[PDB]
Amino acid sequence: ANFVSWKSRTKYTITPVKMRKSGGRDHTGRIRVHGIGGGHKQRYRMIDFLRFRPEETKSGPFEEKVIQVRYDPCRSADIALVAGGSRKRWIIATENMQAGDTILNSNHIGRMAVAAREGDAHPLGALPVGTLINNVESEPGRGAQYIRAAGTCGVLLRKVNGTAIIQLPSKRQMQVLETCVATVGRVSNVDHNKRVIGKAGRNRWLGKRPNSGRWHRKGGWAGRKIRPLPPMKSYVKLPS
Amino acid sequence: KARGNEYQPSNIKRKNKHGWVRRLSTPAGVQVILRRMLKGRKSLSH
Amino acid sequence: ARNVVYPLYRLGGPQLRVFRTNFFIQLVRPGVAQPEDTVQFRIPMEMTRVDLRNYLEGIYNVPVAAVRTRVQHGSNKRRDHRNVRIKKPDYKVAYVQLAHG
Amino acid sequence: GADRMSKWTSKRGPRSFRGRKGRGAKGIGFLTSGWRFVQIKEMVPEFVVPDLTGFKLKPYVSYLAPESEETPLTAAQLFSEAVAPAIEKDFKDGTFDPDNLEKYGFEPTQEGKLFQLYPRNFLR
Amino acid sequence: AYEWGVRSTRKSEPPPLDRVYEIPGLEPITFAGKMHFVPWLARPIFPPWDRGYKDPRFYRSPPLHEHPLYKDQACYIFHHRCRLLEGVKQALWLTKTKLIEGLPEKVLSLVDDPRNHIENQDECVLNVISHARLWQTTEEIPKRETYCPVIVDNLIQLCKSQILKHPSLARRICVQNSTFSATWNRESLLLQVRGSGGARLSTKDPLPTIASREEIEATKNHVLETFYPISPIIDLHECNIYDVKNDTGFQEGYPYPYPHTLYLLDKANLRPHRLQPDQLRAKMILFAFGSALAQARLLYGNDAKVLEQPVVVQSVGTDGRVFHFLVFQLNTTDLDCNEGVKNLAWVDSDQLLYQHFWCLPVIKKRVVVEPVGPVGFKPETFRKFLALYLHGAA
Amino acid sequence: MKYMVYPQTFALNADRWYQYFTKTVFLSGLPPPPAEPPALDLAALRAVACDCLLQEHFYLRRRRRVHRYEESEVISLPFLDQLVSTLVGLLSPHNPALAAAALDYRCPVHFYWVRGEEIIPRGHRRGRIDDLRYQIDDKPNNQIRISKQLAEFVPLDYSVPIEIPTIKCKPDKLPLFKRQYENHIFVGSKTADPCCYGHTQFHLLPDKLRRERLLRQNCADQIEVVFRANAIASLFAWTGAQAMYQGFWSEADVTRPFVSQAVITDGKYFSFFCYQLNTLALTTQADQNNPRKNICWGTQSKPLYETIEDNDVKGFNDDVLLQIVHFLLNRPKEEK
RNA sequence: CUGCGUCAGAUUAAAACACUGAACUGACAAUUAACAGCCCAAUAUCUACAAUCAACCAACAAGUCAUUAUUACCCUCACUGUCAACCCAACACAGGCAUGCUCAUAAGGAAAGGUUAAAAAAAGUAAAAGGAACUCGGCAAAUCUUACCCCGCCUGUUUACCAAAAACAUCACCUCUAGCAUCACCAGUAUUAGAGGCACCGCCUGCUGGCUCCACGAGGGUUCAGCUGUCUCUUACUUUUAACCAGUG
RNA sequence: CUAAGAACAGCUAAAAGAGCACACCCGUCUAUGUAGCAAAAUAGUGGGAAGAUUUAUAGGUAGAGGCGACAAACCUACCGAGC
RNA sequence: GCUAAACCUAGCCCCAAACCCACUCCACCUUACUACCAGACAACCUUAGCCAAACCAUUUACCCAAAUAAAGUAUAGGCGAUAG
Ligand SMILES: [K+]
Ligand SMILES: [K+]
Ligand SMILES: [Mg+2]
Ligand SMILES: [Mg+2]
Ligand SMILES: [Mg+2]
Ligand SMILES: [Mg+2]
Ligand SMILES: [Mg+2]
Ligand SMILES: [Mg+2]
Ligand SMILES: [Mg+2]
Ligand SMILES: [Mg+2]
Ligand SMILES: [Mg+2]
Ligand SMILES: [Mg+2]
Ligand SMILES: [Mg+2]
Ligand SMILES: [Mg+2]
Ligand SMILES: [Mg+2]
Ligand SMILES: [Mg+2]
Ligand SMILES: [Mg+2]
Ligand SMILES: [Mg+2]
Ligand SMILES: [Mg+2]
Ligand SMILES: [Mg+2]
Ligand SMILES: [Mg+2]
Ligand SMILES: [Mg+2]
Ligand SMILES: [Mg+2]
Ligand SMILES: [Mg+2]
Ligand SMILES: [Mg+2]
Ligand SMILES: [Mg+2]
Ligand SMILES: [Mg+2]
Ligand SMILES: [Mg+2]
Ligand SMILES: [Mg+2]
Ligand SMILES: [Mg+2]
Ligand SMILES: [Mg+2]
Ligand SMILES: [Mg+2]
Ligand SMILES: [Mg+2]
Ligand SMILES: [Mg+2]
């Protein structure tokens, strides 16, 4: 199929970029993910998940002032428009973020810990143990990939020998370097999971199509059949 | 309901589906033209 | 001229000149009532109103003010004994208005 | 139900098809921004009409004429009629050299000519 | 970090060169002589090609650093499409001026007496508003790109009928499609303003000074407010290919050299395309400063000092329903430092000419609740518009 | 289906065709002055005329190069708008009517009227009587609308010994093309507007109909045709729409003449026209016994200036300038 | 794609007719651009703030409209579409057919070839007294009408051409899988995504199961009252059909 | 399914996968029709008709498959496997 | 006596022989039969199955370059059908 991905823009901008839906179709044109199609049109707002990105003419710690926290259709959480120096960019907003607040982005690791403020970006080697964190990265310069969803927050369990243990929202531990930059506090839209869809129509507004009507007897346990051993094959079923 | 009117004419669709350019796009469609040239068809495509 | 290759033109190139032209026009009587200054010609399909303007001024020394052309479709309804459609060739009709009244 | 054995012309198809197809007339300009057409004066073929005042020849030929045999013109014939007389005069005088063939009329290259022979850049 | 642009949408890598080219002393056999592609022959390496002549339709500009007007130092350009982030507060710092709420007493005192008011003034403004938004075109509800300019031209035309009372209004015209340029430094920052669009009211006589000498000298104690961490040059066109040049927009000899008032229109149908009230006033101040700065440089040379005769330039910015008034006075041309004499600017914000307009009657349960016409019309707003137009002629 | 009548038209002898469509007789010159019972500074008006003229050509600095095809829409158009805006302010002391007047910039003027009949040649409607409908969609560059109506140039019953031209073929041979869309009657504003009477129109010919191009097309005798063809169509559509706003139409024909003024220019040459709408009944039912006809006066095109060199205007004409002033100084007759 | 314009024709079957006969054959004629289509120098750089009379207010589903800097560039109106009683259904087919206006017309049309007034058949109208006694069933028709049970929460969806449902889907709930990026999922990150069950909610329960209940239904039954030719018991009239005459077949 | 468009009177109501009710979409019941006007229609009676709506245009998914609110539905008037 | 019925060529089949065609002008890979602008896309990969074996599952003949003969022989093969 003559499928060209809309993700062709190479320069970052805060302008909402028009994106075309896929409908669960891959580049070949066949369905690869079911239940995706239609819904209200959305414009993608590019998010800079690398919080510590100093300007071209600047370096080191810098500060940004929040301009507006608004709704993002693409993601569950809300986003905030911040301005640092002579540029503006989108970031993932925290639970407690307003228009006018000042956030700090630094890569400095001091001898002692520092007072962690919600929304600020500091390396994992300078954050107190136990503080809720979000938007963590595997290695420095990789960018935030984990704990992005609304209300999600990780736990800084321990820090040993330049590495830190991060408790993911799925209650799984992850080991990453202490130089990874993370955001203090939870993510916005804490009560996102408390929403009620209300009607089947609203699920079609989000681009989700109804499930297949086939009665699938197959499942995690029902579909998969344990093969009885020849000794146990005699006792599988007894008439009653 | 009532059938028989499955054909809804459209020149854009007709040229894009059975056109000369469409036929020569793939090696399989080239043989389609070659068979009609061998048979002597007055019109090789749309 | 028709059925000939026109030399390609680029910026600063020489003027395109034709010394022998194969365009042949025929004056015809309009089938409908026309203004007095209006003159009707049948011209080959390859001919433009700009060419016809220079064709009449250059050859017949006829001053022309406005030239309007249209393409006339030839009926393909006629069929011979083999039920094969017979095509009447399409021709272009040109309406020429005289210049000085 | 479409006729696939009829000539495809500009009168068939939707609006985009009809405006894009032509009738064979050569283009005499280009389209600029705003759908404005710019006509190039040099692209319009200018007719070189000679003066026919006092011209002896007429469209028909009188029947009281001899039936001369037809002799097609050849390159060998044209060379003998045009270039050969000049070479013979120079050959007898004794001033002949291949370097001066351009003086006899030979063109080593067609570049820089208003009417190139191959490939020709002029109309009929 | 996360790179933008998936590799599928980028240009694919060219196919690897045939191994015949890797053998020294071996001439590959390619299809360059056949003038078409074949799969069983090597791919020729074509040298770069040049057209050989200048073709405007297919011209390619030289690289940016090869442009003659290329400077390492960036110049930040403010134009009609620039939307300042901090609004007025950012505009005040670039122009080195002090904000004063309310129009000057002298300007407002012109229309204080009933003698300078227009006959049936309230009815005339209502008919101007009604014509602009209801009677202008065939369509029931005209778009904003249609009534925003018309509602302003009629008000100027309405104020231009007072030539009977004031013969001094015959020495002014309304220039359209006028531009100007102004270049200056603000703490080692080369800034340039290129105003365009709107109406430029020109006069044969300069506007008289508003603030007295003592009031101008009192600006030295005032200090410009800062907006850290946001930079003063944010939302500005940072261009490295520019030309420092001062331009009043007209050549020498123009009968109306002195600008009187700049009329700015946010004639955009879409709300996002329209400047915010805070941003619109920021555009007015920079354009008023840019127009006044060009006059100061043209008359007093290209030096930097405190002007002996400060230049006053007015400005009126409207969205078609909301009006902003500005009176800018240029007191100095030495803006590199943050100390010393600072300019003054009188600004009126959010002046409603009318609260709302109904192009159709509001019929609820077969009862006409709201008739056709403006709602919440404020005649006091037009008095300020008239006072600015009558400045310098009463 | 209705014929789209274009005022600024490239059709040859379009003035002769539009006279039959509007039932108008064209007269040379201007209407006779009414023999009926301050200081006008010509120097002040002359200076402003040159200042506005020199502003567009020389004084104003262009950010980008102005091309030949943009001269009408970047040089000629602003000059016409600015000249009228300044003149109405300089003539307000001499004419109080202009002060309480509505000035419009490029507003559309529409008028729909029915005149003539035809027998449909082909189709299922062949042999049936169908009326010939016409529509004028004109957008003058400037126009002045006033609350009161101007004085008539000639009486309503006045007649001239000149026959209105009659076309022997169908209107399609002008050429004129038929198209079906919304029928509008528009003076430049809706009916609710008190200023429903027209005073003066200002037109700028398109660069496609410029004088220089018509000379290349052997249309030297068609130069004057374009001026009076635009005036006949635009003023009839203006006066006709004003009559409709007053409740008059074909069956209820006008009881008083409707007059208007127009100034047609290409930027350099100026022409002046005056129109009077004596009759609005043009349908074959109503025009069968209608004796009266519409009257249009016209002047020859004259250049306002000869040549513009730098900041000096060569050969500036005050006769052309005064003719613009007289049109603007015209006012409705005052009551006792 | 010339397919009721003109003219002529040894013409002569369009489901009848036909001399001017003509929706046949041949020739001749025609639809004229302003509308519409056919657009744009390069390189960088810009574009947070819906729409809805956009002003109130109130939202979510988060939306349908913007440039500047420098360089290059000032030649001019070409080309094509334009007819009709028209298209897709083997047909001059009671079907299918997007949008703008007119919302009853200012436009477009003709249900009866002539006759007779048998049966049977179709549609419609009227009816004494009775009012479901008809019938698998108040189906049809008339009238403008109450109370429930069963099933399914509801709007919605399906066997195009015998099944519109109690079936499917559905919010809500529940299970299972996955710790991550440059083409689907996704330019996303466990408050997420996928694979499934069940069918809201509320109550009760295990450590998953059972009832209740709001509205809702061309679902399946039952019923008051009314209504009526459904019936006791049919009858009259009108129209189509019918039969006869003429044409086609 | 994708792209970019269009349509939804009036009334009761309220910021409703609300009610009545046109256009429009669908096809519940009955009758006509059964080589019919129609290889699924007609008349009346019905369900929906601001939404999970209807719809025009172009593009995509192709038979060891596609697609499917599973009817073994549909994929050019014989689909338990197209021609 | 109507409808009809009759007719002899057009051409074709199989061999031999010999190895065949494609630029008059114009248009023709874009929506073929369309005068006239930055591409970078590139070709190659066992046939299967019906059928026979009275099912079917291994298997089952398909010109490979000299007619004849060796010879349906040596061999192969659910040592079956058959292949050779
Ligand atoms: K139901
Ligand atoms: K078998
Ligand atoms: Mg589910
Ligand atoms: Mg299920
Ligand atoms: Mg078919
Ligand atoms: Mg369709
Ligand atoms: Mg044309
Ligand atoms: Mg066919
Ligand atoms: Mg056009
Ligand atoms: Mg009628
Ligand atoms: Mg009868
Ligand atoms: Mg009959
Ligand atoms: Mg009864
Ligand atoms: Mg019973
Ligand atoms: Mg019933
Ligand atoms: Mg249900
Ligand atoms: Mg409910
Ligand atoms: Mg339902
Ligand atoms: Mg069915
Ligand atoms: Mg269905
Ligand atoms: Mg059914
Ligand atoms: Mg269910
Ligand atoms: Mg019972
Ligand atoms: Mg009962
Ligand atoms: Mg009876
Ligand atoms: Mg009979
Ligand atoms: Mg509803
Ligand atoms: Mg409803
Ligand atoms: Mg479905
Ligand atoms: Mg099932
Ligand atoms: Mg089944
Ligand atoms: Mg099929
Ligand atoms: Mg077998
Ligand atoms: Mg078997």
Whether the Cβ atoms of residue F142 and residue F103 lie closer than 8 Å to each other? yes
Helix (H, G, I), strand (E, B) or coil at F273: strand
User: Rounded distance, CA E226 to CA A23, Å?
Assistant: 50
**CA angle at A211 for the pair A206 and A214, rounded to the nearest 5°:** 170
Q: Does C13 touch chain E (CB under 8 A)?
A: no
Helix axes F42-54, F318-329, angle to 10 degrees: 110
Cα–Cα dist A110/A133, whole Å: 18
- Give the residue among A25, A76, A20, A22 at the shortest CA–CA distance from A47: A76
Q: Among the bound ligands, name the one nearest to the CA of residue B5.
A: 5
* In a domain? residue A201: no
Same domain as A146, residue A86: no
Q: Is the N-terminal amide bond of F171 cis, ω within 30° of 0?
A: no
Question: How far, in Å, is the centroid of ligand 4 from the Cα of A35?
Answer: 14
Question: What residue spans of chain A are helical by DSSP H?
Answer: 200-205
Tell whether A50 is covered by a domain. yes
C-alpha A50 chain-centroid distance: 13
Q: Of E89, E85, E73, nearest to E235 (Cα)?
A: E85
In a domain, A127, yes or no: yes
CA of B13 to the centre of ligand 6 (A): 12
| A137 contacts A144 by C-beta, under 8 angstroms | yes
DSSP, collapsed to helix, strand or coil, labels residue F314 as strand
Q: Do C33 and F169 touch (CB under 8 A)?
A: yes
Tell me how far apart the alpha carbons of residues F257 and F234 are, in angstroms, rounded to a whole number.
Answer: 17
Q: Which structural domains are found in chain C, ordered by start?
A: 1-101 (3.30.70.330)
Q: What is the CATH number of the domain that holds B41?
A: 1.10.287.3980
CA C14 to chain D, closest CA, distance in angstroms equals 7
Q: Count of domains in chain B?
A: 1
Chain F residues in contact with E137 by the CB 8 A cut-off are 107-108
Sort E314 into a burial class: Cβ within 10 Å, 0-12 / 13-18 / 19+: buried
CB atoms within 10 A of CB F250: 17
Q: Which ligand is located closest to the Cα atom of residue A37?
A: 29
Give the mutation candidate from C8, C9, C10 for the E interface (greatest E CB count, under 10 A): C10
Alpha helices, DSSP H, located in F155-269: 211-216, 223-245
- Structural domain range at position B43: 4-46
Judge if A56 and A97 occupy the same domain. Answer: yes
DSSP E30: B
| Out of E124, E135, E250, closest to residue F61 by CB | E250
Number of structural domains, chain A?
Answer: 2
Q: Going by C-beta distance under 8 Å and a sequence separation of 6 or more, which residues neighbour residue D42?
A: C9, C13, C14, C15, C16
List CB-based neighbours of ion ligand 3 within 5 Å. A 211
Question: Which bases of chain H are contacted by protein, using any atom under 7 A from a CB?
Answer: 1-4, 11-13, 17, 27, 38-41, 51-53, 57-62, 66-71, 76-77
The amino acid sitting at E230 is I
CA-CA distance, C76 to C78, in Å (whole number)?
A: 6
**Both tokens assigned to F257:** 């003449």
| F162 token code pair | 């000149």
User: To 10 degrees, what angle do helices E277-300 and E88-95 make?
Assistant: 10
Report whether E201 contacts E69 (CB < 8 A): no
Whether A16 is in a domain gets the answer: yes
Q: Which residue has the tokens 């140039």?
A: F153
B6 CA – H75 C1', rounded, Å: 13
Cα(A34) to centroid of ligand 29, in Å?
Answer: 14
∠ CA A100-A104-A109, rounded to 5°: 170
The CATH number of residue A153's host domain is 2.30.30.30
- Rounded to whole angstroms, the distance from the CA of residue E325 to the C1' of nucleotide G129 is 94
| Cα E210 to averaged position of ligand 2 atoms, centre (Å) | 112
F102 interaction partners in chain E (CB closer than 8 Å):
131, 154
The closest nt to D28, taking CA to C1', is G78
Which residues of chain E have a CB within 8 Å of the CB of C11? 53-56
* Contact check, Cβ <8 Å, D46/C17: yes
Distance of CA F212 to the CA centre of its chain: 22
Q: Would you call F190 and E135 a contact, using CB atoms and an 8 Å cutoff?
A: yes
Contact E214/C at CB under 8 A: no
**For residue B6, which ligand has an atom nearest its CA?**
5
Q: Which residues 153-192 of E have a C-beta within 8 angstroms of F?
A: 153-154, 157, 160-161, 163-164, 169-170, 173-179
C-chain residues within 8 Å CB-CB of D53? Answer: none
Q: Residue F231 in contact with residue F260, Cβ under 8 Å?
A: no
Determine which of C17, C42, C72, C76 to mutate to test the interface with D (most D C-beta atoms within 10 Å). C17
E58 touches C at CB < 8 Å: no
Q: F105 and E134: CB-CB below 8 Å?
A: no
Domain boundary residue among A106, A123, A141?
A: A106
Task: Look at phi and psi of residue A158 and say left if phi exceeds 0, alpha if psi is from -120 to 50, else beta.
Answer: beta
Is A20's CB less than 7 Å from nucleic acid strand G?
no
- For A116, other C-beta atoms within 10 Å of its C-beta total 18
Asked if E229 is an interface residue toward chain A (Cβ–Cβ < 8 A), one would say yes
Range of the domain at A16: 1-106
How many residue pairs from chains C and F have C-beta atoms closer than 8 A? 32
Calpha distance D13→D19 (Å, rounded): 10
- Kindly provide the resolution of this structure in angstroms, with one decimal: 2.9
The domain that holds A30 is classified in CATH as: 2.40.50.140
Chain E contact for F112, CB < 8 A?
no
Instruction: Read off the amino acid at residue E306.
Output: V
Residues A80, A93: contact at Cβ < 8 Å? yes
Contact C20 D9 (CB under 8 A): no
Neighbours of chain E (3+ CB pairs under 8 A): A, C, F
- Domain limits, chain F: 1-333
Could you tell me where the beta strands, DSSP code E, fall in chain E?
Answer: 70-78, 97-101, 172-176, 180-185, 190-195, 199-203, 237-241, 258-265, 306-318, 322-332, 343-352, 356-358, 362-364, 367-370, 373-375
Q: Is residue A206 part of a domain?
A: no
In contact, A17 and A74? CB cutoff 8 Å = no
Residue A214: inside a domain, yes or no? no
Asked if E4 reaches chain A (Cβ–Cβ under 8 Å), the answer is yes
Chains in contact with F, counting 3 or more C-beta pairs less than 8 Å apart as contact: C, E
In the complex, which subunits touch D with 3 or more CB pairs below 8 angstroms? B, C
The DSSP call for residue E42 is: B
**Which residues are within 8 A (CB) of F7 and not within 5 positions of it... i.e. 6 or more apart?**
F136, F138, F203, F229, F230, F231, F233, F234, F237
Is residue A230 one of the residues assigned to a domain? no
A60 with A119, same domain: the answer is no
Residue with CA nearest G184 C1'? A26
Q: HSE of E181 in the Cβ direction (CA atoms, 13 Å)?
A: 15
